[PDB]
Amino acid sequence: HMLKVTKAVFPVAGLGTRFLPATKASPKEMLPVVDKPLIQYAVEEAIEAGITEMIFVTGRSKRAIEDHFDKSYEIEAELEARGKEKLLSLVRSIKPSHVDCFYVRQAEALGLGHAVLCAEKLVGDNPFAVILADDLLDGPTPVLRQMIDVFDHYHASVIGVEEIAPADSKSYGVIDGKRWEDDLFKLSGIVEKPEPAQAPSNFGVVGRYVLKPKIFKHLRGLKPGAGGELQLTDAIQSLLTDEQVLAYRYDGTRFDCGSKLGYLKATVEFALRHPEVAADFERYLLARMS
Amino acid sequence: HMLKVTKAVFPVAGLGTRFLPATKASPKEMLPVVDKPLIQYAVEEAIEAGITEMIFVTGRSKRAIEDHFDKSYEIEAELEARGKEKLLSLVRSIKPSHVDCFYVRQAEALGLGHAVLCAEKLVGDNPFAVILADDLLDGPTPVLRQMIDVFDHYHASVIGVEEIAPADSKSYGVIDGKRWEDDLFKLSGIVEKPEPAQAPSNFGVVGRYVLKPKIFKHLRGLKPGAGGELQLTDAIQSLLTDEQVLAYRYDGTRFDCGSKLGYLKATVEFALRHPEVAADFERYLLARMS
Numbered sequence: 001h002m003l004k005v006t007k008a009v010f011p012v013a014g015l016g017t018r019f020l021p022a023t024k025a026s027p028k029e030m031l032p033v034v035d036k037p038l039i040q041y042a043v044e045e046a047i048e049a050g051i052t053e054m055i056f057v058t059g060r061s062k063r064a065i066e067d068h069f070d071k072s073y074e075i076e077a078e079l080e081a082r083g084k085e086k087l088l089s090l091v092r093s094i095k096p097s098h099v100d101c102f103y104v105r106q107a108e109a110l111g112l113g114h115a116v117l118c119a120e121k122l123v124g125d126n127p128f129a130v131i132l133a134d135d136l137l138d139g140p141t142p143v144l145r146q147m148i149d150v151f152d153h154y155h156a157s158v159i160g161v162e163e164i165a166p167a168d169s170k171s172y173g174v175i176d177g178k179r180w181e182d183d184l185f186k187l188s189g190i191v192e193k194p195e196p197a198q199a200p201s202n203f204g205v206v207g208r209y210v211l212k213p214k215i216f217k218h219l220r221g222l223k224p225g226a227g228g229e230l231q232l233t234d235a236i237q238s239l240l241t242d243e244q245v246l247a248y249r250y251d252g253t254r255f256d257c258g259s260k261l262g263y264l265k266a267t268v269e270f271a272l273r274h275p276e277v278a279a280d281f282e283r284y285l286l287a288r289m290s
Numbered sequence: 291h292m293l294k295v296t297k298a299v300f301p302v303a304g305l306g307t308r309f310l311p312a313t314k315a316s317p318k319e320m321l322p323v324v325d326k327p328l329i330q331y332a333v334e335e336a337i338e339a340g341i342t343e344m345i346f347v348t349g350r351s352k353r354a355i356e357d358h359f360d361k362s363y364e365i366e367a368e369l370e371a372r373g374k375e376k377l378l379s380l381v382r383s384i385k386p387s388h389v390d391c392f393y394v395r396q397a398e399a400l401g402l403g404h405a406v407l408c409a410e411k412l413v414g415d416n417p418f419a420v421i422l423a424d425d426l427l428d429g430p431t432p433v434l435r436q437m438i439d440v441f442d443h444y445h446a447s448v449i450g451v452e453e454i455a456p457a458d459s460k461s462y463g464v465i466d467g468k469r470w471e472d473d474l475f476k477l478s479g480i481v482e483k484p485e486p487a488q489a490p491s492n493f494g495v496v497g498r499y500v501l502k503p504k505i506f507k508h509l510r511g512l513k514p515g516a517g518g519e520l521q522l523t524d525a526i527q528s529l530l531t532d533e534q535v536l537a538y539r540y541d542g543t544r545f546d547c548g549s550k551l552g553y554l555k556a557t558v559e560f561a562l563r564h565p566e567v568a569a570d571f572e573r574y575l576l577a578r579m580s
C-alpha cells in the first residue's frame with residue numbers, strides 16, 4: 001500500500017517587491033483576483049486534488065495569511081446577526097471542516113528551496129505537494145490532481161511544466177529530459193533561470209510539484225544558486241542524480257500572477273467569467289479602447 | 291485667523307461584503323489597484339491637499355490598515371540588506387516624515403455617520419476632512435484641495451458631488467439645492483439612496499467632505515436611516531437646517547471601487563497609465579477581446 005499524497009506546502013514567505021507598496025503588510029500570495037486571494041485559489045486546487053492538510057510557510061506579514069484561513073468569530077457573528085446566510089456559507093468554505101491549516105516560519109527569505117526545507121518536520125517521511133500560489137492555474141481537472149495521478153502510477157517525483165517562449169527562460173526553471181508520452185518527460189537535468197541561449201528546452205517549470213521526502217536531504221545540501229537564493233530547482237537536479245524525477249505537461253492554462261502583467265491578465269479573465277459584471281465590463285473595455 | 295483644515299478622517303470599518311472572501315481579514319479599503327491600496331491613494335490625496343494628520347476609523351481587521359501605514363522594521367532592514375534603495379524609498383513614502391497616523395475603533399458597524407462620530411474627540415473643535423477611499427478620484431488638482439479652497443472662501447461645510455445617471459440614485463446620497471456657480475450649490479436638502487423617481491436632482495454625493503465640527507452634535511442626534519444605518523447624510527441634512535452647507539461639483543474623474551465593476555475599471559485604467567505594462571496590456575486586451 002504505497003503512500004498517498006495528503007499534504008501540501010504553500011510558500012508564502014517571499015518579499016513580494018514587484019507589488020510594493022501593496023505587499024508592505026500582506027504577501028503577494030494574498031493579492032485578490034477581483035474578490036479572492038491567489039492563495040485561496042491554490043488551496044482550493046489542493047482540496048479538489050484530495051489534499052486535506054495545508055502547510056503555510058510564512059515570512060513577513062504572517063497574520064494576513066493566518067487570519068484569512070483561520071476562523072473569524074467576529075465576521076461570522078456579524079454576518080449571522082444580519083441574516084447574510086449565503087455570505088456566511090461563503091466565508092466558512094474558506095476552510096472546510098476536514099481541512100487543517102498548519103503554520104511554520106521562514107525567518108529569513110533565503111529562497112524557495114529554503115522555504116520548503118522549513119516544512120521538513122511537518123511533512124515527515126511522506127510525499128507532499130508544493131504549490132506556488134502566484135501561478136494561478138485552471139484546467140479540465142485540477143492540475144495537482146493530474147500530477148498526483150502520475151505520482152501514484154510511476155512512484156516518482158513529478159514537476160509541472162508548460163511550453164515557454166525562449167526569451168522568457170530567465171524567468172523559469174527549465175527542464176532537460178527524455179520524452180515518454182506526449183505530456184511526460186523523464187528528467188536528466190533542470191536549471192534555474194538560464195540565459196535563453198543556454199536553456200536546454202522550451203519547457204519551463206510552473207509552480208506545482210509532487211515530491212518524495214528524499215528531496216529534503218537534497219535541500220539541506222544546497223549552496224546559494226541563482227540570485228543568491230537556495231533554489232528548489234537545484235535540489236531537484238541533485239535528486240534526479242539519485243532517483244527518477246518526471247516532468248508533466250499539464251492540461252490547462254496559467255496566469256503568472258508573480259508579475260503585474262500576469263496579475264492584470266488574471267483580473268481581466270475573472271471579470272469575463274462572472275455574469276454579475278461580465279456584460280458591463282465587456283462594454284466598458286470596448287468604449288475604453290476606442 | 292480662521293481655522294485651517296489639517297485633519298482627515300478615513301472610515302475603513304465597513305463589512306466589505308461585496309469583496310468577500312478577499313475582505314475576510316482586510317478591509318475593502320486595502321484592496322490594491324494593481325500594486326497600491328485604495329486607502330493609500332486617499333491618504334496621498336489628503337497629503338497633497340495639505341493634510342498632515344490621518345485619522346483611521348477601523349473595524350474588523352484593523353491590523354491590515356495599521357501595519358500598512360506604520361513603520362515596518364523588518365521590511366526596511368530586508369530592503370536595505372539587499373541594496374534596493376528605490377524600493378526602500380517607495381516604502382518609506384507610505385508615511386512621510388511630517389504625517390501622523392492615529393487610530394480609533396468603531397466596535398460595531400453601525401454606519402458611516404456612526405464611524406465619523408467615533409473620531410469626534412480626536413478632531414476636537416476643528417474643521418476636518420472625511421475621505422471614503424472606495425471613491426478613487428483623480429483630477430487636474432486633488433479633489434480635496436479644490437474643496438478646502440471652497441471651505442476657506444465661504445466658511446461653510448462642503449460636500450463633493452458629481453452628476454449621476456437617474457437609475458443609480460439608490461447607490462448615492464443625492465443633493466437638493468440652489469446653483470451659485472457652474473460648480474457650486476447651496477444645499478436646501480440631501481437624501482440618502484432615494485428611489486430614482488424620488489431623487490431631487492441628478493447630483494450624487496461622492497466620498498469627499500470638508501465638515502465644520504458642528505456636524506458632531508448632529509451625528510449624535512441621529513436615528514437609524516437607510517439600511518438601518520446611522521447615515522452621515524442625515525446629519526448633513528440636520529446641519530443644513532441650522533447653518534449653510536455647500537455642494538461642490540469637482541473637476542476630475544471617479545471610479546466607484548466600492549463595487550466590483552468600478553474596481554475592475556480602476557484596474558484597467560491604472561494598467562494603461564504605467565509604461566512597464568501598458569503596451570503589453572494593450573496587445574493582450576485586443577487579442578483577448580477578438
Ligand SMILES: O=c1ccn([C@@H]2O[C@H](COP(=O)(O)OP(=O)(O)O[C@H]3O[C@H](CO)[C@@H](O)[C@H](O)[C@H]3O)[C@@H](O)[C@H]2O)c(=O)[nH]1
Pocket residue numbers: 010011012013014015029057059106108109110111112115131132133134135171172173174192193204205206207231232233258
Ligand atoms: O525566500 C523566499 C523566496 C521565495 N519564497 C516563495 O517561493 C515561491 C517562488 O518565489 P518567486 O520569486 O515567485 O519565484 P520564481 O522566480 O517565480 O521561480 C519559481 O517559480 C517558477 C514558476 O512560477 C519556476 O519556474 C522556478 O523554477 C521557481 O524557482 C513563492 O511562493 C514565494 O512566496 C519564499 O517563501 N521565500
Ligand SMILES: O=c1ccn([C@@H]2O[C@H](COP(=O)(O)OP(=O)(O)O[C@H]3O[C@H](CO)[C@@H](O)[C@H](O)[C@H]3O)[C@@H](O)[C@H]2O)c(=O)[nH]1
Pocket residue numbers: 300301302303304305319347349396398399400401402405421422423424425461462463464482483494495496497521522523548
Ligand atoms: O458601519 C460602517 C459602515 C461603513 N463604514 C465606512 O463608511 C464608508 C461608506 O460605506 P459604503 O457602504 O461604501 O457607503 P455607500 O453605500 O457607498 O455610500 C456612501 O458613499 C457614497 C459615495 O461613495 C455617498 O453617495 C453616500 O451618501 C454615502 O452614504 C466606507 O469608508 C466604509 O468603510 C464604516 O466605517 N462603518
Ligand SMILES: [Cl-]
Pocket residue numbers: 013014015016017028
Ligand atoms: Cl515573492
Ligand SMILES: [Cl-]
Pocket residue numbers: 003126127212213
Ligand atoms: Cl513516497
Ligand SMILES: [Cl-]
Pocket residue numbers: 165166167168
Ligand atoms: Cl521568444
Ligand SMILES: [Cl-]
Pocket residue numbers: 212213214215
Ligand atoms: Cl523518498
Ligand SMILES: [Cl-]
Pocket residue numbers: 254255256257261262263265
Ligand atoms: Cl500570464
Ligand SMILES: [Cl-]
Pocket residue numbers: 018258259260261
Ligand atoms: Cl512585474
Ligand SMILES: [Cl-]
Pocket residue numbers: 303304305306307318
Ligand atoms: Cl464597507
Ligand SMILES: [Cl-]
Pocket residue numbers: 293416417502503
Ligand atoms: Cl470651522
Ligand SMILES: [Cl-]
Pocket residue numbers: 455456457458
Ligand atoms: Cl439612467
Ligand SMILES: [Cl-]
Pocket residue numbers: 502503504505
Ligand atoms: Cl462649527
Ligand SMILES: [Cl-]
Pocket residue numbers: 544545546547551552553555
Ligand atoms: Cl466607476
Ligand SMILES: [Cl-]
Pocket residue numbers: 308548549550551
Ligand atoms: Cl459589486
Ligand SMILES: [Mg+2]
Pocket residue numbers: 014
Ligand atoms: Mg523570488
Ligand SMILES: [Mg+2]
Pocket residue numbers: 132134135258
Ligand atoms: Mg513566481
